[PDB]
Every structure is written in structure tokens, then in C-alpha cells.
Amino acid sequence: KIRLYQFLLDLLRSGDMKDSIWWVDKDKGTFQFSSKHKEALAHRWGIQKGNRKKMTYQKMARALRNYGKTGEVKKVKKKLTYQFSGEVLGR
DNA sequence: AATAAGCGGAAGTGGG
DNA sequence: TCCCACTTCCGCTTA
Ligand code: NA
Numbered sequence A: 001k002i003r004l005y006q007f008l009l010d011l012l013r014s015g016d017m018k019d020s021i022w023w024v025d026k027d028k029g030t031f032q033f034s035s036k037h038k039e040a041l042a043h044r045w046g047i048q049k050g051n052r053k054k055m056t057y058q059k060m061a062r063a064l065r066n067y068g069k070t071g072e073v074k075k076v077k078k079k080l081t082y083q084f085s086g087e088v089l090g091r
Numbered sequence B: 001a002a003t004a005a006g007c008g009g010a011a012g013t014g015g016g
Numbered sequence C: 001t002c003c004c005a006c007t008t009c010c011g012c013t014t015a
Helices: A004-014 A038-049 A057-068 A086-090
Strands: A021-025 A030-033 A073-075 A081-084
Touching: A004 A021, A004 A038, A004 A057, A004 A086, A038 A057, A057 A073, A081 A086
Parallel strands: none
Antiparallel strands: A021 A030, A030 A081, A073 A081
16 A cells, blocks of 8 residues: 555656645755645545545644654645655655 | 644554 | 554644
8 A cells, every 4th residue: 555655756746636736846855735725635645545534634744744753754844845855755 | 713734642443 | 462554533732
């Protein structure tokens, strides 16, 4: 089953939900969610995973926060903005 | 107030 | 047994 950071990286590469997520500085791996359109992306994540409940942005961000300690994704001090690690980007 | 972003402890679910 | 990789729930804090 795909991991959340990989789902997000794949979306950014495909551009399939450009109104929900975008690169800020792709060389640094920083990206940002849409305030108004992030829920549609969260819904897609839950459906891809086959979860029992509807996925929300709040629950998806709860999962994202767990990557802070291992480093795959870190929160940036800007609204709705995060940063992939170099290791994640290189793979 | 209304709305929104951000946080994380705790317990539950999946698939090894 | 016991960790993976989240998911779900709940209460709190700041803007
Ligand atoms: Na929000």
C-alpha cells in the first residue's frame, strides 16, 4: 500500500490535482496545499487507501506530523506548507 | 463569535 | 508477540 508521502509526491509529479497542491520551491522540496481545495485531495487519499471513514485534511495532516521525527516530510513555518526530505526527493 | 490552521496523546486497524 | 504505517477520536491553542 502506497505511503502518504509517496501519494503526495506522485500527485505533484503528475499534476492531477493542481488546484489542491503545488510546489513552492521544487528544488527544496517545499509544497503547499490549497486552503479551499485541500479536502478533495484528502478524500482521494482515503479512497485510495480503502479506509473505513471519509478522510479529512485534519486526519491527513495528523499522519503527516508523524513524519517530522523520521524526516520524510517536515512542516514549514508558512500556511499549509511542508517540505520533503532530500532522501524522499532523490527516490 | 465564526472560521481556520496547527498540535499531539491515546487508542484502534492493517499487514506483516 | 510486537512493530508498521497510519487512522480515528478528542481536547487544546493561536490567529
Ligand atoms: Na485548516
